[model samples]
Target: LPGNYFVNVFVNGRKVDSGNIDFRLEKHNGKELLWPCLSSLQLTKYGIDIDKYPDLIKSGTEQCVDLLAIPHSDVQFYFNQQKLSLIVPPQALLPR
Candidate 1:
């Protein structure tokens, strides 16, 4: 079954917001994963909240949108299992 995962978005040294995103990786378990985008704005760190996000159940699963209007460069993505960090730029997304 598929499920949702938690991702924490931060800018500079402050925690901006946190939300959940859908994991639809085929073949794999589709657990918590992070996809990072690059931007030209001011961004420093990205974090993932794996423990807080819910998992898929036997019968059903849930979906979430943890990122929105992210200034391409003001965000970063980190996955614990993969030990990966992606840097995104602010111009990646349209102005909001």
Candidate 2:
């Protein structure tokens, strides 16, 4: 049902990872909005040092991790396109 859809994840317009993810319909301003569920596996794939950030460790096991945990990070999903996009601060990621 929920969280079963797989999509390619993008960070700032760059495709960084892909996996079976989840989506939640959240109520916002009296309207239900589609929210993408992200996990540590994807975040780690995006080059976010999980070992350096203990908060990101919670969802490494895969439970619709919160993008907010990274601070100032946001996500978007295109169901028809099977794409997930993440907008994260540079500091949230490991140096490349």
Q: Can you tell me which runs of candidate 2 are displaced by over 4 Å?
A: 1-3, 28-31, 51-53, 56-62
Q: What lDDT tens digits, residue by residue, belong to model 1 across residues 23-88? A: 453332654434433222212123332222222111222222223333242223455532223333
Regions more than 4 Å wrong, model 1: 1-3, 23-75, 81-96
TM-score of 1: 0.28
Model 2 whole-model lDDT (C-alpha atoms)? 0.70
Worst 10 residues of 1 by lDDT: 50-59
Error of 2 at 44 (Å): 0.7
Tell me how far the alpha carbon of residue 64 in candidate 2 is from the true structure, in angstroms, after superposition: 3.2
TM-score for each predicted model, relative to the true structure: 0.28, 0.69
Name the candidate that leads on lDDT.
2
lDDT score of model 1?
0.35
